[PDB]
Amino acid sequence: NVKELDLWQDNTDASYVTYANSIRMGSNDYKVYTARYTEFNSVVKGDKNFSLYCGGERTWLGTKNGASYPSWTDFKGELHIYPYTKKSGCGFYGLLLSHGGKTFNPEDVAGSLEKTNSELTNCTVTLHNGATLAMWTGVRGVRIAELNTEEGSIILGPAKKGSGNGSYYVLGLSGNDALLAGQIAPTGKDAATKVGIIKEGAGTYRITGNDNLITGAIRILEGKVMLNNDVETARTKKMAGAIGALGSTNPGVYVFEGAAIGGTGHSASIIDLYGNMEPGDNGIGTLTMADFVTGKNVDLRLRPSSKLYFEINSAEEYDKVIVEGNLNHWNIGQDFAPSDKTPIIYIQPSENNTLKVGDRLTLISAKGKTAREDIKWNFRIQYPKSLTWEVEEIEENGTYSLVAEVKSLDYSGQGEVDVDD
Ligand SMILES: [Ca+2]
């Protein structure tokens, strides 16, 4: 049944509550109520529900200042993080993850991992409405196999502002899909304070918040991220969307080779596309790049390895990319070596499509086409094994479009060439 650890007390920085007795859950769910200042430093083993009701902004999983953390690798259950607002006026109500004196390098993820807090890699974690999940100062990482957040929750990153403070949440190792519906943004929306997501594993993470500011960017190493915020509302009300705006230099999304970005919402930051772009979410949709808050151009940064997949049901229903900015091709690969290979467009009619001769599909619309070093480039096209196509790259009235036109319902062999060789 249930064990309850009620550790709450109206305490201060000078009277921390510390609980460190090992827990073997057995057949019991646990419910733990923490004080504002709490060191929850118990080794936990079991496969039951562990619910952590956090009484303030100094409840640590581990010790003060994130100096150490207990073993949770034998915890295989569900960790649920809730607020507990009995003590009012706190900066936030949630859990501070520890770093164990270790620093994370977002540029060398593989080399950072084996010394990063990886205790929550055999369980699931759910961050509930009103709860915050934060880290301390410095540049820190945590590996969480499966994280879902509810609307009204906050992935904060560092508990305090600073250019030297950065928090990277390495999510997805379970291989399962998850939903980040709560906010992802640093304290005070401070632009210099970094909070980042690093996506690994085979599954897809869906991001739906409309007021994010992912200052440490999303780095997609494996699987997919869908930006599924309410873009129509974000346009009208001038909201940040799923990413927010990082400016004209730093990408908000790095899609590495083999991984994918997609969705029905929008990025207000540069997408650096080494990998795949799949508009919609396992189906037809429109993905937008646009900054509704500050009105600046947002470019799609294309690479020699870029691939863009367009599913097409009809002239009325097909995948679209809209860029309120330029298609900006960099002839530099993931390894910094030059290549003259250009992005591939995959034209993919559905199994029950109603395409007709003369249908013109505007797959990509942008303000312009640009390039590192002003080197001219065109998309390579992977045609399907049906119909006959003309692809038209059109610059007109100071705007750009990539159009696929159906010339015949008969097949003319255009799909026999495997472009990616
Ligand atoms: Ca699609």
Residue numbers in the entry: 26 to 446
Provide the authors' own sentences about this structure as they appear in the paper.
To get further insights into the potential role of this unconventional N-terminal domain, its crystallographic structure was solved by SeMet phasing at 1.8 Å resolution. The domain behaves as a monomer in solution and exhibits a parallel right-handed β-helix fold, consisting of 14 complete helical turns with two main short helices protruding from the β-helix backbone. The 14 helical turns are twisted and curved with a calcium ion between the 11th and 12th turns in an octahedral coordination sphere. Neither the catalytically relevant residues nor the active site topology of these families is conserved in the CapGH10 β-helix domain, supporting that this domain is not catalytically active. In order to elucidate the molecular determinants for xylan binding observed in AGE experiments, two surface regions populated with aromatic and acidic residues, typical platforms for carbohydrate interaction, were identified and mutated. The region I between the turns 1–4 and the region II near to turns 6–10. Mutation D344L (at the calcium-binding site) also affected protein stability, but the arabinoxylan/xylan binding capacity was preserved. This result indicates that calcium ion has a structural relevance rather than a functional role in carbohydrate recognition. Only the mutants Y62A and E82A, affected the migration pattern in AGE assays with beechwood xylan and rye arabinoxylan. Both residues are located at the region I, indicating that this patch plays a role in carbohydrate binding.
